[PDB]
Amino acid sequence: EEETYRLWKIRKTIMQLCHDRGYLVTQDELDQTLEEFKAQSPRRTDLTVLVAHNDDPTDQMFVFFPEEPKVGIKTIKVYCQRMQEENITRALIVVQQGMTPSAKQSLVDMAPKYILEQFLQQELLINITEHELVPEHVVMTKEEVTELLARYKLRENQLPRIQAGDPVARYFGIKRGQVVKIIRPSETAGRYITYRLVQ
Amino acid sequence: RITTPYMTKYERARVLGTRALQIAMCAPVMVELEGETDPLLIAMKELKARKIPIIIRRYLPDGSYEDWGVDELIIT
Amino acid sequence: VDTAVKTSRSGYLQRCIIKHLEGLVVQYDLTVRDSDGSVVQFLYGEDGLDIPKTQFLQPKQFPFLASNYEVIMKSQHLHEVLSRADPKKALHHFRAIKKWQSKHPNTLLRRGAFLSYSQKIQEAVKALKLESENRNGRSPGTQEMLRMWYELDEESRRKYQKKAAACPDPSLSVWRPDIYFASVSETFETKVDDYSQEWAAQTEKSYEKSELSLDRLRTLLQLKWQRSL
Amino acid sequence: HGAVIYATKGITRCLLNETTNNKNEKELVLNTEGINLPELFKYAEVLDLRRLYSNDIHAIANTYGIEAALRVIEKEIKDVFAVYGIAVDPRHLSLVADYMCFEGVYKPLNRFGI
Amino acid sequence: GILFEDIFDVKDIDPEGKKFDRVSRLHCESESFKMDLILDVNIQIYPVDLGDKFRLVIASTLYEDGTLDDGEYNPTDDRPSRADQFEYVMYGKVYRIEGDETSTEAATRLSAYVSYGGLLMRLQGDANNLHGFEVDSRVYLLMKKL
Numbered sequence: 001e002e003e004t005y006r007l008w009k010i011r012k013t014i015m016q017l018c019h020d021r022g023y024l025v026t027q028d029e030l031d032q033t034l035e036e037f038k039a040q041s042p043r044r045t046d047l048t049v050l051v052a053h054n055d056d057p058t059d060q061m062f063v064f065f066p067e068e069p070k071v072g073i074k075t076i077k078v079y080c081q082r083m084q085e086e087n088i089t090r091a092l093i094v095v096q097q098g099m100t101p102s103a104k105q106s107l108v109d110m111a112p113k114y115i116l117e118q119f120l121q122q123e124l125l126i127n128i129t130e131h132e133l134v135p136e137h138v139v140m141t142k143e144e145v146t147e148l149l150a151r152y153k154l155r156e157n158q159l160p161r162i163q164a165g166d167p168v169a170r171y172f173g174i175k176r177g178q179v180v181k182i183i184r185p186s187e188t189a190g191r192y193i194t195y196r197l198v199q
Numbered sequence: 200r201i202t203t204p205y206m207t208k209y210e211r212a213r214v215l216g217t218r219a220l221q222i223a224m225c226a227p228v229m230v231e232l233e234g235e236t237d238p239l240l241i242a243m244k245e246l247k248a249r250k251i252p253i254i255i256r257r258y259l260p261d262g263s264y265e266d267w268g269v270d271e272l273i274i275t
Numbered sequence: 276v277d278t279a280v281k282t283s284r285s286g287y288l289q290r291c292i293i294k295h296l297e298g299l300v301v302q303y304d305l306t307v308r309d310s311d312g313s314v315v316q317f318l319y320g321e322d323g324l325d326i327p328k329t330q331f332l333q334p335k336q337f338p339f340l341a342s343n344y345e346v347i348m349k350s351q352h353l354h355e356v357l358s359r360a361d362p363k364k365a366l367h368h369f370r371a372i373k374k375w376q377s378k379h380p381n382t383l384l385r386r387g388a389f390l391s392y393s394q395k396i397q398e399a400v401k402a403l404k405l406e407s408e409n410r411n412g413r414s415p416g417t418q419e420m421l422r423m424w425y426e427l428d429e430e431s432r433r434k435y436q437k438k439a440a441a442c443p444d445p446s447l448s449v450w451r452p453d454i455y456f457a458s459v460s461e462t463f464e465t466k467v468d469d470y471s472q473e474w475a476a477q478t479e480k481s482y483e484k485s486e487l488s489l490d491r492l493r494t495l496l497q498l499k500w501q502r503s504l
Numbered sequence: 505h506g507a508v509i510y511a512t513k514g515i516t517r518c519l520l521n522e523t524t525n526n527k528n529e530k531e532l533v534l535n536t537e538g539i540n541l542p543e544l545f546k547y548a549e550v551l552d553l554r555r556l557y558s559n560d561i562h563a564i565a566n567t568y569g570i571e572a573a574l575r576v577i578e579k580e581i582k583d584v585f586a587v588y589g590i591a592v593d594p595r596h597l598s599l600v601a602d603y604m605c606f607e608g609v610y611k612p613l614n615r616f617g618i
Numbered sequence: 619g620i621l622f623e624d625i626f627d628v629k630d631i632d633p634e635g636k637k638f639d640r641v642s643r644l645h646c647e648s649e650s651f652k653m654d655l656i657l658d659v660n661i662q663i664y665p666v667d668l669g670d671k672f673r674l675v676i677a678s679t680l681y682e683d684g685t686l687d688d689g690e691y692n693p694t695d696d697r698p699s700r701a702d703q704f705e706y707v708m709y710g711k712v713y714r715i716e717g718d719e720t721s722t723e724a725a726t727r728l729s730a731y732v733s734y735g736g737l738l739m740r741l742q743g744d745a746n747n748l749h750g751f752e753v754d755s756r757v758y759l760l761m762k763k764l
Contacts, residue, residue: 024424026389029417049413131556134569135572138441153259153263158314159314161606184571187462190460190461196608202304202453259303294618295618316602324595
């Protein structure tokens with residue numbers, strides 16, 4: 001019954017990850033304890049969640065928990081079919097051992113039609129975003145980046161870079177070309193604000 | 200129009216240097232010198248009286264510039 | 276034998292750092308930028324402020340600056356700079372920040388509009404959602420909340436948003452610490468508040484006449500900050 | 505000799521340095537002499553995984569990101585200078601760490617960084 | 619122009635143990651007032667011992683006729699009626715007045731710290747009779763054994 005503890009931690013972390021992306025999540029899911037998780041729900045196909053977005057109610061996300069410890073191209077297709085038929089665009093695949101290396105470039109191959117993304121199970125046992133040293137990241141909107149570049153007379157290159165595989169760019173699901181504001185809690189100035197272009 | 204109103208120390212240094220190099224090349228002194236042979240003392244005397252017709256052209260990191268007057272600049 | 280070996284080791288390390296960091300200069304916008312135009316920092320050490328002029332801006336020295344208010348104001352700052360300096364834009368920002376932090380004591384509590392519309396939690400758990408299963412993995416009782424919130428709420432007056440909005444961004448970020456009076460760092464204004472509260476409660480029992488007021492000491496400290504930039 | 509029964513990858517030994525604080529003396533620390541960040545994530549109820557620290561700066565930069573490696577760089581330089589009583593101002597280490605981690609990776613300040 | 623006058627008696631010659639060369643710190647205690655006095659006195663010029671009395675006065679002027687002092691020292695002054703009934707005269711300034719610690723109690727006692735160049739004195743007692751003092755005020759400490 002440690003499998004259940006792992007399932008509960010991963011589900012709580014994914015609920016927090018979905019709330020930080022701006023999806024409609026209730027307080028109970030974010031404050032759900034183990035005794036009630038196991039009360040509700042055992043399997044790995046009824047842990048799949050489907051969440052809606054604050055705006056764009058059609059824009060929803062779908063979280064998978066594949067059974068195969070090493071997901072492959074066929075496993076990816078089997079529920080890319082589910083997504084294509086239910087009419088969703090985004091997904092999130094929590095894998096237990098990894099993805100066979102061809103799969104990673106397949107997930108990338110699926111054009112903005114159906115954009116997927118993978119997360120290891122050991123990466124979700126804790127919320128890195130809740131570490132002391134990790135600042136708060138905020139994906140800037142297309143109209144705030146323009147005002148930033150205009151205030152500092154900048155170009156989008158010539159800005160600090162954040163890797164597209166950064167453990168906190170993968171969590172906040174930030175695509176390439178997006179600028180993220182970062183609020184460092186500084187011992188010197190309190191709440192220093194920086195900006196990083198995702199690339 | 201958006202940069203600091205005061206005159207940085209580097210600007211004071213360069214303005215004094217240039218005014219002194221001008222005075223030394225036989226330029227008219229608008230400060231009524233009183234027996235001093237140093238052009239840098241004369242340049243300081245002029246800076247204190249707010250008589251220096253030079254235009255500090257502050258360059259921003261993208262090529263854009265702002266032209267300030269040495270008179271319209273708070274000397275500390 | 277050891278002193279000789281150490282000089283070679285340290286000198287090589289200085290050359291490497293010097294060769295890389297040599298072109299990083301503070302600019303008119305107050306940003307430390309490289310010669311390429313690249314922005315390493317947006318304020319020099321997270322707050323402008325030169326390490327030399329920040330020695331007495333340390334709580335433990337307002338006691339000294341207070342004692343020498345008249346010379347520090349007359350000889351350096353001048354009463355005039357206080358006359359030419361206006362703080363409304365920055366002062367209002369700090370009031371907004373203070374109000375926000377007053378309404379949110381725990382700043383790591385997952386603020387959200389919909390999350391804020393979980394206070395009916397008991398309203399739903401009582402009798403409403405008692406009959407369902409995990410339809411799409413969420414819950415039997417979460418779907419009732421989703422339905423009540425989604426479109427069964429006011430069009431433009433479902434303003435749980437304001438109760439759940441971000442803290443105003445720091446003043447140095449928006450209000451240009453150099454040309455904007457009273458725009459200081461969030462850690463300096465806290466120190467100034469603490470000292471003003473511990474100094475208005477010393478004048479009361481002082482047996483020496485103080486001709487300085489908490490709100491002239493505040494302007495003194497704000498000018499001495501704005502000038503150490 | 506090089507045949508080991510079983511070991512967590514990267515960890516060579518742990519040890520609980522009982523006291524680390526006088527203010528709240530009650531603190532206990534599980535120091536280690538190896539580095540494997542994920543192999544501690546399983547004990548989020550035994551140990552505090554926020555407050556986790558390592559001197560690696562490449563492992564932190566891979567589990568928490570680059571903005572979290574900046575502060576590890578700064579704290580490492582500060583603790584290196586502290587053993588001799590020297591104290592460089594934080595405004596200098598901030599600039600050094602911001603330059604090193606400018607372009608998303610922990611880049612060395614050497615011949616291959618140019 | 620007197621701010622305080624009393625007859626003390628030396629109780630301790632130097633309790634703290636810090637010992638300077640020509641200076642001795644006397645711990646006295648007034649009579650009929652029960653005021654306390656800590657006094658650094660130059661004992662090479664003016665030897666003092668235990669169980670010794672002395673009349674002590676603090677003033678703001680030496681003329682005892684109203685005219686203020688000018689802050690200038692002339693050894694040639696022609697007004698020679700300045701207080702000379704006193705053997706040891708000093709001249710310092712008060713640098714600290716601090717009401718006593720006790721709260722919830724009357725505790726309307728004050729400690730006045732005076733510096734005489736480098737020789738400190740502390741007068742502690744009922745505030746009622748230490749009102750003439752104020753920080754940064756120049757005062758003369760006249761003394762005369764008995």
